[PDB]
Amino acid sequence: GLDAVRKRPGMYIGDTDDGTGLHHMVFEVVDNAIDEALAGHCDEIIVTIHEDESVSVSDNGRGIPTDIHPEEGVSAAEVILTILVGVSVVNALSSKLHLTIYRAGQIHEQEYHHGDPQYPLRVIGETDNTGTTVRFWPSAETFSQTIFNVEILARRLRELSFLNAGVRIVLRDERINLEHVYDY
Ligand SMILES: Cc1[nH]c(C(=O)Nc2nc3c(O[C@@H](C)c4ccccc4)cc(C(=O)O)cc3s2)c(Cl)c1Cl
Ligand SMILES: [Ca+2]
C-alpha cells in the first residue's frame, strides 16, 4: 500500500523539509544492513554519496530472498520493496531505486520509479558473493531539499560502528573524494 506513503510521506519518513526525513531514507536502508550484521551474516557495509547526489548502501549479508512469494506471485525482494518504517517507504519516496542481490551463486537486479517496478527481478550474472546493494534517488516532489550531508551520515555511521563492533562501515562522498572507515 505505497499510495498512502506517496500521498502523506511525513507520516512514514518524518519531516520532508528540515533534512531529518531525507537522512532517515539512508538510515532506514543502513538499518536493514545492520540487522544482517546483528544476525551474524554481514561484517562490511559501504555507504556512498554519488556525484549525482544518489546514495548506495552495500552489505555482504545473505542477500534479500529472490524466490517467488506464493501469496504475491512476484520475487520476495519485490514484495519487501513494494508492500508496506520498511525499505518499501524509501522505495515509495525515491524517483528511482536500483536493487542488486548477490545470492545462491547469482546476481539479481530490479529497478523502480516512485516504487513501481520497471521489470520483474532478473538474473544478470554469476557471483561467489552474497549481499544486497540499494541505490536510491530521493524524490524532489516529496523532499524540498534532496542533498545528503556527509557530516549527518558520518555521525550516525560512527554510532552504528560503536554499537556493532564486528562491522566495518565505509563512508564514501564522491562529491569531495572523501572515504572514512568506521571499525570498532
Ligand atoms: C541493504 C539491505 N539489506 C537487506 C537485507 O539483507 N535484508 C534481508 N532480509 C532477509 C530475510 O528476511 C526477509 C524475508 C524480510 C525482510 C524484511 C521484512 C520481512 C522479511 C530473509 C533472508 C533469508 O531467509 O535468507 C535473508 C535476508 S537479507 C535489506 Cl532489506 C536492505 Cl534494504
Ligand atoms: Ca565536487
Numbering used by the authors: 29 to 112, 132 to 231
Paper text:
Interestingly, compound 27 was the only compound in the whole series showing activity against the novobiocin-resistant A. baumannii mutant GyrB R150C (MIC = 8 μg/mL), which resides mainly in the (S)-enantiomer, as confirmed by several independent experiments. Hydrophobic interactions were formed between the pyrrole moiety and Val57, Ala61, Val85, Val181, and Val134, while the hydrophobic α-methylbenzyl group at position 4 of the benzothiazole core interacted with Ile92, Ala104, and Ile108. Important interactions are hydrogen bonds formed with Asp87 in A. baumannii (Asp73 in E. coli, Asp75 in P. aeruginosa), the conserved water molecule, Asn60 in A. baumannii (Asn46 in E. coli, Asn48 in P. aeruginosa), Gly 95 in A. baumannii (Gly81 in E. coli, Asp83 in P. aeruginosa), and Arg150 in A. baumannii (Arg136 in E. coli, Asp138 in P. aeruginosa) as well as cation−π stacking with Arg90 in A. baumannii (Arg76 in E. coli, Arg78 in P. aeruginosa). Comparing the inhibition of gyrase and topo IV, compound 27 as well as its two enantiomers are better inhibitors of gyrase in E. coli and P. aeruginosa, whereas in A. baumannii, the inhibition of topo IV is better.
